Amino acid sequence: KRRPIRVLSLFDGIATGYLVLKELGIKVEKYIASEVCAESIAVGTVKHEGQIKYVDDIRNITKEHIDEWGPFDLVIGGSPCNDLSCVNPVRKGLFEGTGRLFFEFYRLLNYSCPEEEDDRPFFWMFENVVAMEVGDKRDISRFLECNPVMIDAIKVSAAHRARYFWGNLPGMNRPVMASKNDKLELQDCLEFSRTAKLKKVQTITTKSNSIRQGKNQLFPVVMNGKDDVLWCTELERIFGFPEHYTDVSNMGRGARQKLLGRSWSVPVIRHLFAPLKDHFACE
Amino acid sequence: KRRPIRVLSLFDGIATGYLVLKELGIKVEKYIASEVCAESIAVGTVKHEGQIKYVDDIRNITKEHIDEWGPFDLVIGGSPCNDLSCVNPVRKGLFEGTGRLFFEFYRLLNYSCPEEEDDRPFFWMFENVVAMEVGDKRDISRFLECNPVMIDAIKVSAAHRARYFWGNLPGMNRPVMASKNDKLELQDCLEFSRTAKLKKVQTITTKSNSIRQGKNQLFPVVMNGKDDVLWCTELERIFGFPEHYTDVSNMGRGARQKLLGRSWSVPVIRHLFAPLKDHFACE
Amino acid sequence: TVPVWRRQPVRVLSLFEDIKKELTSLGFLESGSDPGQLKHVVDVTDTVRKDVEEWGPFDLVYGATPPLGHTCDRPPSWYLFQFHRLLQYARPKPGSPRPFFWMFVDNLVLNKEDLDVASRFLEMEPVTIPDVHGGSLQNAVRVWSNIPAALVSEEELSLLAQNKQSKWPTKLVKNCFLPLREYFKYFS
Amino acid sequence: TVPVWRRQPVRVLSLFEDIKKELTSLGFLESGSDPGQLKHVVDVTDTVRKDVEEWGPFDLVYGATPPLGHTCDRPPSWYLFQFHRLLQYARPKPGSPRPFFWMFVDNLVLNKEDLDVASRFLEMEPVTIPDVHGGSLQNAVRVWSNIPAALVSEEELSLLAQNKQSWPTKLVKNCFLPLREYFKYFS
DNA sequence: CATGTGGTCTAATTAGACCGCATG
DNA sequence: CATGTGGTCTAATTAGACCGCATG
Ligand SMILES: Nc1ncnc2c1ncn2[C@@H]1O[C@H](CSCC[C@H](N)C(=O)O)[C@@H](O)[C@H]1O
Ligand SMILES: Nc1ncnc2c1ncn2[C@@H]1O[C@H](CSCC[C@H](N)C(=O)O)[C@@H](O)[C@H]1O
């Protein structure tokens, strides 16, 4: 009947995809990831017990690699948004610098895409920021031949995260509803003795200034009467990752907030991956 | 007929004594800790659900404080050894620097000792290093009126940790044995895909060079071909602490290693605290 | 192969530079043709696959990086990526095989990393056509193409591009269009 | 208080310094007694509680820190800590109520930190006794004691201890004096 | 002879202040 | 007008190199 799912993960980072597929019961046969930061590779290799195959730089994978490693049923991707987000002033755009890496994703997608005679199921998803210039968005849409759906994590987590998602998954525009296990408020993610001055927080970048909310940059936590910033475990709880999911490779708060700031929201990707349980085998 | 235990922990640090008592199933009515390092207090407060009372510096604790907070059934102590150990070339001895803090223990101990009419059981324990000058050990024994038992943690863990223990606990001289859960080799404490070059590890301190074993300063773990230092979770496994027990307060690697290098060995203190189940109420 | 009387007039799609004035010199286009077997579009940012399919079937797709200095609100990589997109839009169905060709030429506008992304997205190494006059090279192009169409080092080309910042070399590439005479009809 | 014919000679234990030739000069010990009912040990490093208990029951224990010309083999705090450790041995059982006294005197060799440690371990603030000659202080001492026995600011004492770095038993004998109402007065 | 609940000094390493403007 | 999957620069901040000698 139903068969396990074969995934090709692009700019995988901390392997949020595999984690969602696992938490969903979907049985995974292959999970080929392309990642270059050794810390993220360590996260993925430890927290999933070496079930993920890593393929290194995206610009060194050929069509022969896609055919041999293939066939693939799912292709996830989220390219670097360093030259695309409008928070960086020196941003170079989609056709210069990090943005160009998007065209690698594209290049592989049409490689792994089934031919016009093969009616096999094949799914794909690409994610990037909303805070990009409209030209970058329209060009990404043109190359993907799809218009995006904008999802903010504030409906399912305790933080804002407006992100654009292109793809063909079932019901990508279906209404987003919250689950009973989702921590909607900041207090639901905090630790003992800590109090949330806020109920929802802003978007969390890889930088420290994002952890201080408001135009006046206020601290979010109060502990023993003092103003304190968020802890790493609470960031993991906000994003939806399991607790101590990023506690590897002797990483301090810098590398951990960096890896989490480039990542996805676990409940959002759970929502977007949920319909796949009807096409593929479930554990 | 057994009653919950009432504890007084001077220099509590990572609150190892509470962890050991609650792992042995002993009901604790009162646990008063005297710690100054805010990060240690954070570990103890978060990981034990605020069931611990902190009373700041031991030098500001008066006999009236002992009478108010008391009476006490257990006294626990481990004073700073930076001026007692021989690894420090600028050690100041037992009567200068941090060594003087030992005499605070002594003081509070005499404040908490029951009257001779009180047949109520009263237990106490003091821990310090083996690598101290013979005069300092002599004087500690003189002031405590008993000789110490020497215990190395290699019999129950994967690292060397030679420590002197003064006290009157039942059977402190009985032979030490390793339970099934005692991770004896270094490979048992390592993460996925990381292999141990050594079967046992040298004595781990707050300083980083303690991780580099041998006169050649050889790394103890290899991964993907290259040598690497021990991770914080692996250190927590070595000392017997639960995983991510010290993952609080946005602490980097150095702070965690400091905290763990000052603390005790969990299985050693479990061995020492096991007899108290026969006198006090178990869960 | 196709016989002479069954050869059809070729239908081409020029993507950045107009080769009409040059292909009409090789007898692939009639000087007067309101049907316009060549489709030329210069700003392809708003082009959808349905536009390419509605414009009609194409036998050839041509693109070129703007000649040195003649740039405008676009990097060199933009032309390569857009050419790849539109070529994928125009490539015929594999189950309906037909003579199909494409070409992309650079006038030393792409640097080394752009050269690598070009060779990766076009799946072949370029050929370097030189213009040697008086024993000295004056201009040069790089061509990626699937048509079965003098040696000099990369240092000479680098110094040539360095000096020639202070222009279209269509004559060099024209020969590369000659092999197309056997598949499509030849005007007088 | 106790009647005079029932007053007994006081058994005293002098630590670090010797109060003989001073208390005997006051009338608490006879000069001829070879045992002298006084115990004196200068190096208390290897003294056990059983040693103190065997050395006889004591009515008074005394300790003093060596003056600016100290033995300087031990820190000034060693004398205080060892005095505490031994006094805790020499005290009588609660069920044996008896007149028991103690005294520790510092000759300005302790630092303010060690002063606080001393006041913490001895459970009281000291009393500074001054030697005033020609309206000018010459020497002074600090005394902790439980015996029911001229004002100077700590800056005079600070500059004094600073200059005099280049034994005021007389100042302390007055503090011993109130012990007459409990023990025998020798002629 | 090897080792060690370390301290100091200096070279990296990191983190906070600063800046930035296109889109709702 | 508030905001933002960021880069730069520089002041703290941290970590590795160095040193150290009393005891089984
Ligand atoms: N050339 C390249 N090849 C492969 N991965 C690359 C790359 N350049 C950057 N990356 C990786 O691409 C990632 C983009 S950040 C996106 C991470 C992912 N969305 C998540 O949820 O974790 C980064 O982790 C970066 O290390
Ligand atoms: N004056 C003081 N009062 C109380 N605690 C103090 C102190 N000076 C130092 N300390 C604390 O005493 C601890 C000694 S290290 C021993 C830690 C503890 N035995 C454990 O097993 O975790 C240190 O953590 C230090 O922060």
PDB file of N, CA, C and O in Angstrom, chain B residues 53-75:
ATOM      1  N   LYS B  53      15.867  26.647  49.801  1.00  0.00           N
ATOM      2  CA  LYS B  53      15.966  27.979  50.385  1.00  0.00           C
ATOM      3  C   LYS B  53      17.434  28.385  50.444  1.00  0.00           C
ATOM      4  O   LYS B  53      18.257  27.662  51.012  1.00  0.00           O
ATOM      5  N   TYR B  54      17.755  29.536  49.858  1.00  0.00           N
ATOM      6  CA  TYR B  54      19.116  30.057  49.830  1.00  0.00           C
ATOM      7  C   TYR B  54      19.272  31.167  50.865  1.00  0.00           C
ATOM      8  O   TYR B  54      18.352  31.965  51.072  1.00  0.00           O
ATOM      9  N   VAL B  55      20.438  31.212  51.521  1.00  0.00           N
ATOM     10  CA  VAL B  55      20.637  32.107  52.659  1.00  0.00           C
ATOM     11  C   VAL B  55      21.930  32.901  52.513  1.00  0.00           C
ATOM     12  O   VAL B  55      22.474  33.407  53.510  1.00  0.00           O
ATOM     13  N   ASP B  56      22.427  33.012  51.282  1.00  0.00           N
ATOM     14  CA  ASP B  56      23.520  33.937  50.939  1.00  0.00           C
ATOM     15  C   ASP B  56      24.809  33.482  51.645  1.00  0.00           C
ATOM     16  O   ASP B  56      25.003  32.282  51.883  1.00  0.00           O
ATOM     17  N   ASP B  57      25.672  34.433  52.003  1.00  0.00           N
ATOM     18  CA  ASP B  57      27.007  34.101  52.488  1.00  0.00           C
ATOM     19  C   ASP B  57      26.961  33.363  53.827  1.00  0.00           C
ATOM     20  O   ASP B  57      26.138  33.663  54.695  1.00  0.00           O
ATOM     21  N   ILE B  58      27.869  32.395  53.993  1.00  0.00           N
ATOM     22  CA  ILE B  58      27.958  31.655  55.250  1.00  0.00           C
ATOM     23  C   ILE B  58      28.506  32.526  56.377  1.00  0.00           C
ATOM     24  O   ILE B  58      28.208  32.279  57.552  1.00  0.00           O
ATOM     25  N   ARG B  59      29.282  33.560  56.044  1.00  0.00           N
ATOM     26  CA  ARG B  59      29.864  34.425  57.063  1.00  0.00           C
ATOM     27  C   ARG B  59      28.837  35.348  57.704  1.00  0.00           C
ATOM     28  O   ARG B  59      29.115  35.919  58.763  1.00  0.00           O
ATOM     29  N   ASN B  60      27.665  35.508  57.092  1.00  0.00           N
ATOM     30  CA  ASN B  60      26.593  36.324  57.647  1.00  0.00           C
ATOM     31  C   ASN B  60      25.527  35.486  58.340  1.00  0.00           C
ATOM     32  O   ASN B  60      24.494  36.027  58.748  1.00  0.00           O
ATOM     33  N   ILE B  61      25.755  34.185  58.481  1.00  0.00           N
ATOM     34  CA  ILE B  61      24.844  33.299  59.196  1.00  0.00           C
ATOM     35  C   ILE B  61      25.239  33.294  60.667  1.00  0.00           C
ATOM     36  O   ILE B  61      26.389  32.996  61.010  1.00  0.00           O
ATOM     37  N   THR B  62      24.289  33.624  61.536  1.00  0.00           N
ATOM     38  CA  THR B  62      24.514  33.706  62.972  1.00  0.00           C
ATOM     39  C   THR B  62      23.919  32.487  63.666  1.00  0.00           C
ATOM     40  O   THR B  62      23.143  31.726  63.083  1.00  0.00           O
ATOM     41  N   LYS B  63      24.311  32.298  64.930  1.00  0.00           N
ATOM     42  CA  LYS B  63      23.726  31.222  65.722  1.00  0.00           C
ATOM     43  C   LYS B  63      22.223  31.408  65.877  1.00  0.00           C
ATOM     44  O   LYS B  63      21.477  30.423  65.946  1.00  0.00           O
ATOM     45  N   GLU B  64      21.762  32.659  65.933  1.00  0.00           N
ATOM     46  CA  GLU B  64      20.327  32.916  65.950  1.00  0.00           C
ATOM     47  C   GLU B  64      19.677  32.452  64.653  1.00  0.00           C
ATOM     48  O   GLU B  64      18.560  31.921  64.666  1.00  0.00           O
ATOM     49  N   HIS B  65      20.366  32.640  63.523  1.00  0.00           N
ATOM     50  CA  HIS B  65      19.881  32.090  62.259  1.00  0.00           C
ATOM     51  C   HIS B  65      19.784  30.572  62.325  1.00  0.00           C
ATOM     52  O   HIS B  65      18.822  29.982  61.824  1.00  0.00           O
ATOM     53  N   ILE B  66      20.777  29.923  62.938  1.00  0.00           N
ATOM     54  CA  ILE B  66      20.762  28.466  63.047  1.00  0.00           C
ATOM     55  C   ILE B  66      19.588  28.004  63.900  1.00  0.00           C
ATOM     56  O   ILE B  66      18.900  27.034  63.563  1.00  0.00           O
ATOM     57  N   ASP B  67      19.333  28.698  65.012  1.00  0.00           N
ATOM     58  CA  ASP B  67      18.228  28.313  65.885  1.00  0.00           C
ATOM     59  C   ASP B  67      16.879  28.546  65.213  1.00  0.00           C
ATOM     60  O   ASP B  67      15.979  27.704  65.309  1.00  0.00           O
ATOM     61  N   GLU B  68      16.720  29.683  64.530  1.00  0.00           N
ATOM     62  CA  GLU B  68      15.471  29.964  63.828  1.00  0.00           C
ATOM     63  C   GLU B  68      15.224  28.947  62.721  1.00  0.00           C
ATOM     64  O   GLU B  68      14.168  28.304  62.672  1.00  0.00           O
ATOM     65  N   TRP B  69      16.195  28.793  61.817  1.00  0.00           N
ATOM     66  CA  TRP B  69      16.041  27.871  60.699  1.00  0.00           C
ATOM     67  C   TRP B  69      16.020  26.422  61.161  1.00  0.00           C
ATOM     68  O   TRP B  69      15.399  25.573  60.512  1.00  0.00           O
ATOM     69  N   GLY B  70      16.685  26.120  62.272  1.00  0.00           N
ATOM     70  CA  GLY B  70      16.814  24.763  62.738  1.00  0.00           C
ATOM     71  C   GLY B  70      15.545  24.215  63.357  1.00  0.00           C
ATOM     72  O   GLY B  70      14.467  24.813  63.264  1.00  0.00           O
ATOM     73  N   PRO B  71      15.650  23.047  64.004  1.00  0.00           N
ATOM     74  CA  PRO B  71      16.856  22.215  64.151  1.00  0.00           C
ATOM     75  C   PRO B  71      17.210  21.526  62.837  1.00  0.00           C
ATOM     76  O   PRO B  71      16.398  21.495  61.917  1.00  0.00           O
ATOM     77  N   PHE B  72      18.414  20.975  62.706  1.00  0.00           N
ATOM     78  CA  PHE B  72      18.855  20.351  61.468  1.00  0.00           C
ATOM     79  C   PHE B  72      19.225  18.896  61.717  1.00  0.00           C
ATOM     80  O   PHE B  72      19.790  18.557  62.763  1.00  0.00           O
ATOM     81  N   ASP B  73      18.902  18.043  60.748  1.00  0.00           N
ATOM     82  CA  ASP B  73      19.241  16.629  60.807  1.00  0.00           C
ATOM     83  C   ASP B  73      20.484  16.279  60.003  1.00  0.00           C
ATOM     84  O   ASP B  73      21.159  15.297  60.326  1.00  0.00           O
ATOM     85  N   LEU B  74      20.802  17.057  58.970  1.00  0.00           N
ATOM     86  CA  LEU B  74      21.968  16.802  58.137  1.00  0.00           C
ATOM     87  C   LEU B  74      22.695  18.114  57.882  1.00  0.00           C
ATOM     88  O   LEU B  74      22.062  19.138  57.614  1.00  0.00           O
ATOM     89  N   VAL B  75      24.020  18.078  57.984  1.00  0.00           N
ATOM     90  CA  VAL B  75      24.878  19.199  57.615  1.00  0.00           C
ATOM     91  C   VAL B  75      25.804  18.737  56.498  1.00  0.00           C
ATOM     92  O   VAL B  75      26.446  17.688  56.609  1.00  0.00           O
TER      93      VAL B  75
END
